[PDB]
């Protein structure tokens, strides 16, 4: 049966196996995330979803930690805010200054979560990392200096598209996502990696540089290319 957990002191009944992130979603709080996608598996590596339990001295990964009976989740606590600020500091410390020339532009999760949960200043006084750009076909443009190594494309590729040609080569700070060979990621479901990439590492090549998210008007229609009716 349902177990009772507490989010900021508010009681909520959740099924066993529910994670902290899903419990907060039920109570109406959206914990920040970079690697967690509800349609993909759980990775737990970006470390952006760390939250504080009231009596636990260690922060837990909300996207991968199942809730226990009588757990109080402090989403807006000082430890949670400091953890978010530190993780955002690391990500932006290694990220490049490409926002004006980046198609992600005003619809970037790194920008929005930096503005909402991260600090407004940089303590990084060293040199940044530059990564060679790969080529995976005429549809997806890869500028991999902007990759945050969140492994969404790898998990999507394998699980959803049944294609296992994406992965991480090397280790440490020099870990790179790619094919390791000149192989085109050509599939009928290839633009979804453009969608799910939280940063501008993977972007649409036909749409490149044409517009910005705030200018466009959104019209909700359906698809006529096939009989699925997407």
């Amino acid at each position: 049966n349902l177990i009772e957990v507490f989010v900021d002191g508010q009681s909520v009944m959740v099924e066993p196996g529910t994670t902290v992130l899903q419990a907060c979603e039920k109570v109406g709080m959206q914990i920040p995330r970079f690697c967690y996608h509800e349609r993909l598996s759980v990775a737990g590596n970006c470390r952006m979803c760390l939250v504080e339990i009231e009596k636990a001295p260690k922060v837990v990964a909300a996207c991968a930690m199942p809730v226990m009976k009588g757990w109080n989740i402090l989403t807006n606590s000082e430890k949670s805010k400091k953890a978010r600020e530190g993780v955002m500091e690391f990500l932006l410390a290694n990220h490049p200054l490409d926002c004006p020339i980046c198609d992600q532009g005003g619809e970037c999760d790194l920008q929005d979560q930096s503005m909402m949960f991260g600090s407004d200043r940089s303590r990084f006084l060293e040199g940044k990392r530059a990564v060679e750009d790969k080529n995976i076909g005429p549809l997806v443009k890869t500028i991999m200096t902007r990759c945050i190594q969140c492994t969404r494309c790898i998990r999507f590729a394998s699980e959803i598209a049944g294609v296992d040609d994406l992965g991480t080569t090397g280790r440490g700070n020099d870990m790179q996502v790619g094919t390791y060979i000149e192989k085109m990621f050509m599939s009928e479901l290839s633009g979804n990696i453009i969608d799910i990439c939280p940063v501008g590492a993977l972007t649409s090549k036909p749409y490149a540089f044409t517009a910005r998210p705030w200018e466009t008007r959104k019209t909700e229609s359906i698809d006529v290319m096939d009989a699925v009716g997407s």
């Binding site: 060679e132 296992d164 992965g167 080569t169 020099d174 790179q176 094919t179 390791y180 060979i181």
Partner: protein, 217 residues
């Protein structure tokens, strides 16, 4: 400290999917013995031993060898590439006959490990990551090799040469290039991790079976 080695593959005449590589029948027997050390339905667990065997046979790991291993184990070539690039004992680039790996971590750095490295560089006339012109020696720096108490030490084709001095390492290099195989082990007169001055423990004969056996046990 940048590694200096790329993690991307550019096809070359010497390294391409058409490069000839295939296991010998003895290596196929070894592979079939390795594969059945793991539960059925988990053949992917043999990727590391099979890649190690391929490297031992060939001297290094070409992309064709990686593809052959992937085909043999029915695992994705991308997964094989991930393993090969992650693990540092796999040579994705041709190396010399002898691969000197000098430990340069702090327990060895406290003793004169820089002296050993400098002596090796002077003896061979190469830098810290290059290869001799005759394709005989390659020299690299490595992290802890697990022989800290015998620092400084080097590893040459899975052979530990410990308690080294510049003269000792020069002698080892000369013996290797002559054709002989130097005896691995400490070069300071010690046989093992025991203290150099003398045995401060285990000075008496070991007790036989059933020395302090519990009453019931």
């Amino acid at each position: 400290g940048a590694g200096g080695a790329l993690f991307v593959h550019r096809d070359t005449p010497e390294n391409n999917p058409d490069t000839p590589f295939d296991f010998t029948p003895e290596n196929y027997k070894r592979i079939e013995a390795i594969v059945k050390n793991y539960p059925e339905g988990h053949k992917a667990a043999a990727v590391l031993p099979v890649l190690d065997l391929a490297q031992r046979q060939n001297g290094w790991l070409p992309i064709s060898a990686m593809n052959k291993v992937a085909e043999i184990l029915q695992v994705p070539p991308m997964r094989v590439y991930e393993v090969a690039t992650f693990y540092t004992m796999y040579n994705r680039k041709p190396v010399g006959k002898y691969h000197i790996q000098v430990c340069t971590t702090t327990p060895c750095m406290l003793r004169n490990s820089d002296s050993i490295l400098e002596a090796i560089q002077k003896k061979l006339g190469i830098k810290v990551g290059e290869t001799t012109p005759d394709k005989l020696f390659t020299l690299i720096e490595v992290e802890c090799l697990g022989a800290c108490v015998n620092a400084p030490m080097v590893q040459i084709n899975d052979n530990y040469y410990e308690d080294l001095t510049p003269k000792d390492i020069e002698e080892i290099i000369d013996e290797l290039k002559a054709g002989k195989i130097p005896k691995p082990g400490p070069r300071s007169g010690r046989f093992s991790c025991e203290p150099a001055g003398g045995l401060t423990s285990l000075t008496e004969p070991p007790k036989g079976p059933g020395f302090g056996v519990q009453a019931g046990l």
